[PDB]
Amino acid sequence: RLPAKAPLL
Amino acid sequence: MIQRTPKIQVYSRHPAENGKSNFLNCYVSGFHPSDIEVDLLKNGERIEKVEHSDLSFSKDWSFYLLYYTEFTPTEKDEYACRVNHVTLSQPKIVKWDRDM
Amino acid sequence: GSHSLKYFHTSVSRPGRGEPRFISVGYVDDTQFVRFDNDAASPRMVPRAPWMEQEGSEYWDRETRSARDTAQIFRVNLRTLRGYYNQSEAGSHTLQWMHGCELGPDGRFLRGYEQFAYDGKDYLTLNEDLRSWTAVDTAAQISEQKSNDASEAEHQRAYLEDTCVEWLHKYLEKGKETLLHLEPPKTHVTHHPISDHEATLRCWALGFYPAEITLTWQQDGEGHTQDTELVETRPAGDGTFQKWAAVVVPSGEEQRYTCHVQHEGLPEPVTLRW
Incomplete structure (x- = not known):
């Protein structure tokens, strides 16, 4: 499954 | 910004023979950015029922797509693809060779 | 033999036509099995392999929410990187994200990777130890410090070493008749x-x-x-x-x-x- 939270750049 | 010209392959899903249904594929890969115009031609005429795969990319971040349609190869009929990308000075036409 | 679970995220800003285009695809080895495309009123994650059509609504609702949240984050990231490089809003730009995990021959975790790209070039890379980042320029070093502020390398290492491996096992079982063939x-x-x-x-x-x-x-x-x-x-x-x-x-x-x-x-x- 997808990662729950995407990183902020 | 880095841009990449697309690589193009036109081919059939199966070994083509006249009067037998098949799939005409146009494989575009190694390009960047993702915006690209791909057309499939029957005797220079645009084919309408054309589908394509979902956008993906390789380790070098260059994208690839598979454009395909159902067709029946014959002797008289020529098949090609028109590819237009921001990196190209003009649209590129690649004819279909059933031996390739 | 080794197996892998890979996701590929692409976000492209649209200067005068609204929110950025966002597309995410997932691969098990060389087989695509899901797709998300935000070019819809209420975009959803859909199956792209026959063995995925047995998933219940719990899975697709969760993956849809995750993908929608990622699209919003990438829209924020595209605005941030535009400010880093002092780029105009009239230009279209691309942000890419790839991550995945690989299993060894014993079926256990072998390695993991995560990488970001901006306009076709490397931007921020998760190092092979999965504990530090590699920035390409001063702009990505700001992103690196932000990642350090959030302990992001730890959160992604937890995803790659645990969540990714567990769900790859699930996918390999669901599609065993074709994935393991x-x-x-x-x-x-x-x-x-x-x-x-x-x-x-x-x-x-x-x-x-x-x-x-x-x-x-x-x-x-x-x-x-x-x-x-x-x-x-x-x-x-x-x-x-x-x-x-x-x-x-x-x-x-x-x-x-x-x-x-x-x-x-x-x-x-x-x-x-x-």
Whole structure:
């Protein structure tokens, strides 16, 4: 499954 | 910004023979950015029922797509693809060779 | 053998036409199984492999929410990177994200990776220890410090080493009848005379899975040949792949040339002539 939270750049 | 010209392959899903249904594929890969115009031609005429795969990319971040349609190869009929990308000075036409 | 679960995220800003286009696809080995495209009123994650159609609403609702949240974050990231490089809002830009995990032959975690790209170039990379980042310039170093502020390397390492591995096991079981099935290439040689003195021998490999394959032309049973035309492996459209290798040989000497095919679906390499 997808990662729950995407990183902020 | 880095841009990449697309690589193009036109081919059939199966070994083509006249009067037998098949799939005409146009494989575009190694390009960047993702915006690209791909057309499939029957005797220079645009084919309408054309589908394509979902956008993906390789380790070098260059994208690839598979454009395909159902067709029946014959002797008289020529098949090609028109590819237009921001990196190209003009649209590129690649004819279909059933031996390739 | 090794298996992998890979996701590929692409976000492209649209100067005068609204929110950025966002597309995410997932692959198990060489097989795509899900897709998300935000170019809809209420975009959703959908199956792209037959063995995924047995998932209940709990899975698709969760993946849809995750993908929608990622699209919003990437829209924020595209605005941030635009400010880093002092770029105008009239220009279209691309942000890419790839991540995945690989299993060893024992089925346990082998390695993981995560990478970001901006406008076709590396931007921020998660190092091989999965504990530190590598920035390409001063702009990405700001992103690195932000990542350090959030302990992001730890959160992503937890995803790659645990969540990714657990769900790859789930996918391999659901699609075992095709994911764990090696398809050998069906091979043959074609002959195309170029003149009275030379001819082309083209060695075909059709309908194989996975995509890794090696085609080599050998003369007199001795190693390598000099002038071989090799095409990039290409998808057939049905889940299998294609490739061919061509060599120009003197007419009458075609029996000296042998094509060698290496592929996981073959217990031993295959040798063929025209």
